Amino acid sequence: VAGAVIDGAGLGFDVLKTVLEALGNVKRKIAVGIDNESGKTWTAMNTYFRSGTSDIVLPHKVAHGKALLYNGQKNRGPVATGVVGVIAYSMSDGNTLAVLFSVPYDYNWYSNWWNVRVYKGQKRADQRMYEELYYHRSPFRGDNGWHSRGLGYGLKSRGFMNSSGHAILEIHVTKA
Amino acid sequence: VAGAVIDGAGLGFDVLKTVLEALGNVKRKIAVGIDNESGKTWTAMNTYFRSGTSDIVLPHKVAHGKALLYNGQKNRGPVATGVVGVIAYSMSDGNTLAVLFSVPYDYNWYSNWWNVRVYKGQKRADQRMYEELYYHRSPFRGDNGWHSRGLGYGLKSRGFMNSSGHAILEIHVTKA
Amino acid sequence: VAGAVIDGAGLGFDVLKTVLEALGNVKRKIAVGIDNESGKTWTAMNTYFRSGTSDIVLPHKVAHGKALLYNGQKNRGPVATGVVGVIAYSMSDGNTLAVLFSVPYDYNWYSNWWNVRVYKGQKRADQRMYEELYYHRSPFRGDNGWHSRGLGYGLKSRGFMNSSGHAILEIHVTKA
Amino acid sequence: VAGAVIDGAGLGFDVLKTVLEALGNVKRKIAVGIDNESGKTWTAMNTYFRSGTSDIVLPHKVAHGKALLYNGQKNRGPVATGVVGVIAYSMSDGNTLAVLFSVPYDYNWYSNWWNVRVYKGQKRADQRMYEELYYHRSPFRGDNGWHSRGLGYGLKSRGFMNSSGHAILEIHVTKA
Amino acid sequence: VAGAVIDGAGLGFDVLKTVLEALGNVKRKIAVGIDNESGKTWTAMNTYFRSGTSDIVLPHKVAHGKALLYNGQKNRGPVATGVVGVIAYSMSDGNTLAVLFSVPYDYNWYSNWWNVRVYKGQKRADQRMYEELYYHRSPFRGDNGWHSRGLGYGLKSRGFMNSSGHAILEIHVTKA
Amino acid sequence: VAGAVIDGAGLGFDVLKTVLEALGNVKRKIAVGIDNESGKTWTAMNTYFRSGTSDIVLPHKVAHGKALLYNGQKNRGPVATGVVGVIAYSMSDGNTLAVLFSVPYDYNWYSNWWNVRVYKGQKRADQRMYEELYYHRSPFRGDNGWHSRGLGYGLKSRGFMNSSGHAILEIHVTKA
Amino acid sequence: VAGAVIDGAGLGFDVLKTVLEALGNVKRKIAVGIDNESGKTWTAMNTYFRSGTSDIVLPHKVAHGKALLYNGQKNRGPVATGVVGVIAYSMSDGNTLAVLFSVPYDYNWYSNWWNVRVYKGQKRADQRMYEELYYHRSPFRGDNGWHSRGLGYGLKSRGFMNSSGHAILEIHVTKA
Amino acid sequence: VAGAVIDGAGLGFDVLKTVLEALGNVKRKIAVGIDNESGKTWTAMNTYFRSGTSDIVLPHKVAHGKALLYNGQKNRGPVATGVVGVIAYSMSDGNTLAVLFSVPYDYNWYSNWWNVRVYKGQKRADQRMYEELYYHRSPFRGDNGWHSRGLGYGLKSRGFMNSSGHAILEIHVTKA
Ligand SMILES: CCCCC/C=C/[C@@H](O)[C@H](COP(=O)(O)OCC[N+](C)(C)C)NC(=O)CCCCC
Ligand SMILES: CCCCC/C=C/[C@@H](O)[C@H](COP(=O)(O)OCC[N+](C)(C)C)NC(=O)CCCCC
Ligand SMILES: CCCCC/C=C/[C@@H](O)[C@H](COP(=O)(O)OCC[N+](C)(C)C)NC(=O)CCCCC
Ligand SMILES: CCCCC/C=C/[C@@H](O)[C@H](COP(=O)(O)OCC[N+](C)(C)C)NC(=O)CCCCC
Ligand SMILES: CCCCC/C=C/[C@@H](O)[C@H](COP(=O)(O)OCC[N+](C)(C)C)NC(=O)CCCCC
Ligand SMILES: CCCCC/C=C/[C@@H](O)[C@H](COP(=O)(O)OCC[N+](C)(C)C)NC(=O)CCCCC
Ligand SMILES: CCCCC/C=C/[C@@H](O)[C@H](COP(=O)(O)OCC[N+](C)(C)C)NC(=O)CCCCC
Ligand SMILES: CCCCC/C=C/[C@@H](O)[C@H](COP(=O)(O)OCC[N+](C)(C)C)NC(=O)CCCCC
Ligand SMILES: CCCCC/C=C/[C@@H](O)[C@H](COP(=O)(O)OCC[N+](C)(C)C)NC(=O)CCCCC
Ligand SMILES: CCCCC/C=C/[C@@H](O)[C@H](COP(=O)(O)OCC[N+](C)(C)C)NC(=O)CCCCC
Ligand SMILES: CCCCC/C=C/[C@@H](O)[C@H](COP(=O)(O)OCC[N+](C)(C)C)NC(=O)CCCCC
Ligand SMILES: CCCCC/C=C/[C@@H](O)[C@H](COP(=O)(O)OCC[N+](C)(C)C)NC(=O)CCCCC
Ligand SMILES: CCCCC/C=C/[C@@H](O)[C@H](COP(=O)(O)OCC[N+](C)(C)C)NC(=O)CCCCC
Q1: Can you tell me the distance from the alpha carbon of F97 to that of F133, in angstroms, rounded to the nearest whole number?
Q2: Could you give the CA distance from residue A113 to residue A104 in angstroms, rounded to a whole number?
Q3: Chain E neighbours among D 11-70 (CB < 8 Å)?
Q4: How far is F94 from chain E (nearest CA, A)?
Q5: Which residues of E touch D17 (CB under 8 A)?
Q6: How far apart are the C-alpha atoms of B82 and B76, rounded to whole Å?
Q7: A3 in H contact zone (CB under 8 Å)
Q8: Quick one: which of B165, F86, F131, G47 has the fewest CB in 10 Å?
Q9: Result of mutating residue 5 to C (chains A, B, C, D, E, F, G, H)?
Q10: What string of H, E and C letters represents the secondary structure of E28-48?
Q11: Residues D161, D140: contact at Cβ < 8 Å?
């Protein structure tokens, strides 16, 4: 009897929502804290999200001896996407401090990654800047380790990123 | 037997409310903060909502060196509408400061957008003003970036809007 | 078998209460704040509710330079009624300050409205005073806009009312 | 099969308790505040409840320039009764201040009402005193309005009562 | 099929516990506060509960100008009994102050009652003392009224008891 | 069909746990407070529980002019046992202060009881000491009354115990 | 029909988890507090758990006139094991203070026990030391009694352990 | 009838999620606290997790006389993995302080373990360093005992680790 079709639909429907409420609860997020000990003032340009979003303003100014705090997180709902993108600040020397972060949904296939680079001139973050920092500029793993690196322009980085979905990226930018 | 119609209705009813309680939980909202460093006093006229509503008063006065805070949100219930509209303030020079915001329900088809314009004279916001600022005056994306722009009348804007359903729009209006 | 009648009744009963608990949760309410800068003292008369009720006392006195706060809300339970009515204050010049508010249940068919008028003499609010202010005296929409209006008797109004079910009506009464 | 009788009973039983838990949640109550500016001391006699009860002591003394606070509420459980009765205070001039309140269960058939009277001598409240103040002495409606009235004995009343099930009755008793 | 007996038992069992959890929630209790302004010191003897119990110690001493606080409540569980009994204090003049309270379960058949008497000598409370004070010594109703009464021995009472299941009994004992 | 055995088991199982969760919630406990005004120091020996247990240490010392606080409660789980036993303290005169308490599970068949005795020498509490104090030494009822009694050895008791399952036993031991 | 096998499995599965969630909730734990008034400093070696575990560090030092606090508890999950073991501290005289505790799961078959011994030299606790203190060295019962005992080496113990699953063991070690 | 397949699936599905929510609740974690009394400054390199992750930054600096606090935990979700890995700090003498921890999921097959070693030069932790410290360098058990060990380079360790899934590892590093 078609009585069994109605229950099939019922079970089928309870499966569906269990699965959607599950994927809904997977959280991927990133706290970013960058310490400006560069000797110059940074002014915010933008954050290009390749994946996910943010709920806050990107701090506009950041003086010598101050820290910038920003964060983001994957899109709400049962999507299987993470939080991935690039933060671009212009510096008072005319150049751009850029910072990559990647906190993926599917840890089977992907890992956490980060990067820091100083591009020449004012460059807003975008799909190209992300592709460069992610695929072609020796990005660091979110491997629970500290990594130092010279940036040019009389500057060096030193940064840490943990390996979980509740990611934090701490970076210090000092005079090399 | 019509026994299976009664269960079909039952399942059909539980589907319905699951879907309505879902759409009921989608939140779209906007916090707006505008900093008046324009040298003149602004007096509120109104907010035209193309979509959604607000639960608070639109601050009547805003002096030099003060900030205006307003907000809104989509209509209550299981509608698939967002929060979209224009805020109009009259300025003590005889002109209108207008500000667009768009925070749509369906991010598949739409994005966050904002705009700032200075119209000549007292102009209340309405469907026409919205259509202009949205479709025909190079509105900025809610792209997690800062965007500067001269307004005429010895004034410039500089504003930020994030990309999510929990939108904020921060704008500073300064003497160009 | 009459087994299906028992379930029909069951489903039919669960429909009913879902719908009644829903209509039960729809809230319509109004916060009213009127600022007396009229130069005279107001003394309360009454509030005629065309729809809904209040849970508090209508403030008896309101001096020069003070504000009156009152509120109301629709009737409890699964009724489809709103909150609608008129507040009447006598003023020390012998006349009545009257104030309309309308926050309807069914926004398909209706909108928020308000009005402010100065009637000559002591006039308690009632169905007639409401019908006048609502249908025949150019009432303002709850349209998220400020609206000024001279009242006669050396007085002007300037008021705001938002467009939602969680309505507020802010009105300032100053010496014209 | 008598299987359908067992479910009929089941549904029938779930109907019953839904209805009883509903009527159980209807609250009818009254907060009473009377301000003694009569020049004399009041001493409490009693409160005759025609309907409902109270959970507190009726304040025994109330001097010149002090206020009395009392309250009550309908009977607990799924009864369809309200809170209705008369409060009697003896006054130091030898007479009784009496105060009626009525907050009914079924607002289809009834409204809120109140009254204030000064009876000669010591008179405890009771069914007769209630019937007088309710049916035969021009009681005021709980109509969200202020109502003044001379009491004799060099005294006047001025009182307010809202229209809802969460009733309050505020009364001031001053020298006439 | 005996399948319907198993469901009959099931329904029958859910009826039972609904009813037992209901009767379990009926609370009957009594707070007692007696003010000793008798000029003598009272020393506690005991409380005879005709119905119900207490969870606290009966205060042993109570000086001139102090108050005694005690309370009780009906027996835990789905019994249909109330809280009813007599409190006996010996007084420093050699006599006993006795106090009745009755807060019944079934308000259809019974009411709240109280009494105060001064017996000659040391008399512990018991079934006889209760029967006297309840049936044969003009006990006062828990009628939301104050009642004064001379006690002999240069003493008078003046006491109040409300009419609900959440009873309080306030009594003042002063020098007549 | 054995289908009805599976449901019989099911119902039978839901009966069982309802009954076990009920008996699990019955609490029987005792707070004990003994005031040492005996002129000597008491040192704890032990508590023999005939029924139930404790979760705390039996205070080791108790000087002149100090009070001892101990408590216990029935065994965890759906047992139908109470909390019943004897507390033995050695006193600095070479003798034992012993104290009985009984707070039974089944108030149909049993009541609360207590006792105080002074035994000669060091005697730990045990089944015999309990049997003596319970069955053969005129123990006091937990009857919501104070009871005085000479103990010998220049000492008297005066103690109170309420009648409920949430028992407290307050005893004062003073120089006769 | 195999329909009854599916329900048999269902019931069978609900039995299983009810029983596993039950055994999961049985808690067995032990708080240990030992007061060092031995004249020497103790240094921790280890705790051998015959059954269960701990979640904290075993305090390393414990001076003259200080107390050591440690605790443990049975293993998480639906096991039927308790918390049982031996604590070994080295003392500044070259010897070991050892302390047994046993808080079993199944009180049908077992009781609480404790012991205190001073072994010559540094001896870590282990299965042998436990077997000695438990089976062969006259261990004290967790019987809600104080028990004194000379330890040799110019030292005596005096300890208490209650009889419940929420065990505490208080021991004082003083100069004999 | 295929009705029994639909229920089989249903039961089968409820089994599955009960089991997944269970494994989801098993927590394995580690708090690590290391006290630097080595006379030199440590600088963090990294933490290699063989199993699990962390949610925090590995403290970068740790001076003489200060303590480092870090922690981690197994991966979120119904995996049967623990938290296992090695922490590597460079020391101001040019060498690496390394610290192993192992807190496994399946206590049937595995135990808690820890280790401390001083490697020559800067060596980041990794799979090899873990395999050495775990399999080949006499690691200590998480056995609720203190264990001392000379490290070379004028340094010794002394550390404690408990035996449970809520592991802590406390280690002191002092001058040898
Ligand atoms: C069928 C299983 C294969 C999973 C392929 C995963 C592709 C991901 O790179 C992106 C999302 O990558 P995500 O933003 O989370 O992580 C960042 C990875 N990138 C560094 C490459 C951007 N996945 C999706 O957009 C959803 C695919 C739906 C079918 C399972
Ligand atoms: C079942 C577990 C096996 C894990 C296999 C790992 C594959 C990964 O090497 C890369 C992911 O590399 P990822 O982008 O995290 O890192 C590359 C490093 N850079 C970013 C520096 C280039 N996977 C892909 O590129 C496509 C996977 C989805 C298609 C089925
Ligand atoms: C069915 C898939 C296509 C969705 C078409 C989207 C229409 C929206 O513009 C408006 C609401 O506009 P919203 O508040 O999202 O965004 C503002 C739209 N603008 C950006 C153009 C102003 N949605 C509706 O009126 C309900 C549509 C039900 C159709 C099945
Ligand atoms: C097809 C039914 C649409 C609802 C029609 C509403 C008419 C309203 O005037 C009043 C409610 O008036 P409300 O409180 O919304 O606001 C007053 C509106 N006016 C100021 C214009 C009178 N409705 C009722 O009294 C019962 C409606 C029964 C529908 C199940
Ligand atoms: C289908 C969407 C309609 C768009 C909203 C327009 C509403 C108006 O046409 C009036 C609303 O007139 P209202 O009383 O708000 O007056 C508008 C202007 N005044 C307040 C000044 C009179 N509607 C009704 O009276 C219908 C209610 C009968 C339901 C079967
Ligand atoms: C179908 C007509 C039923 C309503 C008739 C109302 C009678 C009321 O006077 C009193 C309740 O009076 P209440 O305490 O609310 O208010 C006092 C009413 N008076 C002002 C007349 C005294 N009713 C009852 O005690 C049981 C009626 C069961 C109705 C569902
Ligand atoms: C469906 C809406 C129509 C309401 C019609 C109102 C009837 C009421 O005037 C009186 C209410 O009289 P009430 O005593 O509140 O008002 C008179 C005011 N005084 C008490 C001051 C004289 N009802 C009754 O007397 C009997 C009601 C039971 C019928 C089954
Ligand atoms: C069948 C309905 C008749 C109710 C008869 C009530 C008798 C009560 O006095 C006593 C309890 O009286 P209570 O202690 O609550 O109130 C005090 C009443 N006295 C002043 C007489 C002690 N009831 C019981 O012990 C339970 C009877 C079970 C059959 C329904
Ligand atoms: C359905 C509502 C009708 C109420 C009928 C009231 C009866 C009461 O007068 C007395 C209760 O009188 P009570 O003891 O509260 O007060 C008498 C006053 N003194 C205590 C001063 C004697 N009932 C009884 O004595 C036995 C009732 C149970 C047998 C079926
Ligand atoms: C079945 C109805 C008769 C209840 C007989 C009571 C026995 C109690 O003395 C003891 C427990 O004694 P308890 O802690 O209540 O009270 C102390 C008893 N004394 C006052 C004699 C010490 N109960 C049990 O051992 C479980 C009985 C299961 C029989 C179906
Ligand atoms: C008929 C089964 C009764 C339970 C027998 C218990 C034996 C105990 O030695 C240990 C637990 O010892 P425990 O942790 O209670 O305390 C140690 C007791 N001794 C100190 C004597 C070893 N039990 C187990 O290891 C598994 C019992 C499986 C029952 C489903
Ligand atoms: C029937 C035998 C199954 C248990 C074999 C255990 C393998 C473990 O080394 C690792 C887990 O190692 P874990 O993170 O707990 O601890 C590290 C273990 N080592 C110390 C050897 C590295 N297992 C897995 O990753 C998936 C096994 C699914 C078993 C239900
Ligand atoms: C049912 C209880 C019996 C437990 C028997 C213990 C086996 C363990 O010695 C080792 C655990 O070796 P583990 O690496 O913890 O200990 C050696 C210690 N070191 C790592 C320091 C060398 N197990 C394995 O190597 C494979 C387990 C998977 C079999 C299906």
Answers
A1: 12
A2: 9
A3: 13, 17, 44-49, 53-58, 60
A4: 31
A5: 18
A6: 10
A7: yes
A8: F131
A9: In V8C/K69C; loss of ability to form stable pores after addition of a new disulfide bond
A10: CEEEEEEEEECCCCEEEEEEE
A11: yes
Distance between CA atoms of D113 and H143, rounded to whole angstroms?
Answer: 78
* DSSP-derived 3-state class of residue E24: helix
Looking at the domain covering F1-176, what would its CATH class be?
mainly beta
| Contacts (Cβ under 8 Å, ≥6 apart) of C67 | C33, C34, C35, C36
Name residue C41's beta-bridge partners: none
Instruction: Return d(Cα D168, Cα A83) in angstroms, integer.
Output: 55
CB atoms within 10 A of CB C84: 25
For residue E158, what is the nearest residue in chain D, using CA coordinates? D60
F135 CB near ligand 10 (under 6 Å): no
Dist CA D84 CA D161 (whole Å): 14
**The amino acid at B93:** D
Would you say E130 is a known binding-site residue?
A: yes
Which helix (H) or strand (E) segment holds residue E17: the answer is: helix E3-25
F130 is in an annotated binding site: yes
Task: Give me the sign of the Cα torsion angle H106, H108, H109, H110.
Answer: positive
Residue C161, amino acid:
M
Rounded-to-integer distance, Cα C130 and Cα C100, Å? 7
The answer to whether the CB atoms of E53 and F163 lie below 8 A apart is: yes
Quick check: E121 contacting F, CB < 8 Å? no
Confirm or reject contact between C2 and chain B (CB < 8 A).
no
Nearest to H59 by CA among H88, H92, H84, H28: H88
Alpha carbons E43 and E57: distance in angstroms, whole number: 13
Task: Give the span between the Cα atoms of G112 and G161, in whole angstroms.
Answer: 8
Q: DSSP characters for G107-118?
A: TTT---EEEEEE
Residue D133: half-sphere exposure toward Cβ, Cα within 13 Å:
28
For residue B114, the surrounding DSSP H or E stretch is strand B113-119
d(CA A19, CA H16): 12
Determined by which method? X-ray
Give the Cα separation of E51 and E44 in Å (integer).
Answer: 20
Stated resolution in angstroms: 3.1
Substitution site in B51, B83, B130, B133 for ligand 3 pocket (most atoms within 8 Å of beta carbon): B51
Do H and G touch (≥3 CB pairs < 8 Å)? yes
- Which of D35, D164, D171, D172 to substitute to test the interface with C, most C CBs within 10 Å? D164
Chain E contact probe: residue of D5, D18, D21, D76 with most E CBs at under 10 A? D76
Look up residue C59 and give its amino acid. P
The whole-angstrom separation of Cα E69 and Cα E62 is: 10
Task: Please indicate if any CB of chain D lies within 8 Å of the CB of E8.
Answer: yes
Q: Is H139 in the pocket of ligand 13 (CB under 6 A)?
A: yes
Q: Return the closest-CA partner of residue C116 out of C174, C72, C166.
A: C174
Q: Are D142 and D161 contacting, i.e. CB atoms less than 8 angstroms apart?
A: yes
Is residue H28 exposed (0-12), middle (13-18) or buried (19+ Cβ within 10 Å)? Answer: buried
Residue length of chain F: 176
Size of interface A-H (CB pairs under 8 A): 56
Residues 6 or more apart whose CB falls under 8 angstroms from that of E173 comprise: E34, E35, E36, E37, E38, E97, E116, E151, E155, E156, E157
Do G10 and H15 lie within an 8 Å CB cutoff? no
The residue of chain H with its CA nearest to that of G14 is H15
For ligand 8, atom 26, name the residue with the nearest CA.
E80
Nearest to A120, CA basis, from A156, A150, A100, A96 = A96
Planar angle of CA D63, D66, D69, nearest 5 degrees: 110
Residue D3 has φ and ψ, to the nearest 5°, of -45, -40
Do E136 and E111 touch, CB atoms closer than 8 A? no
List of chain D residues whose C-beta atoms are within 8 Å of the C-beta of residue E19: none
Pick the closest to residue A76 from B170, B107, B82 (CA basis). Answer: B107
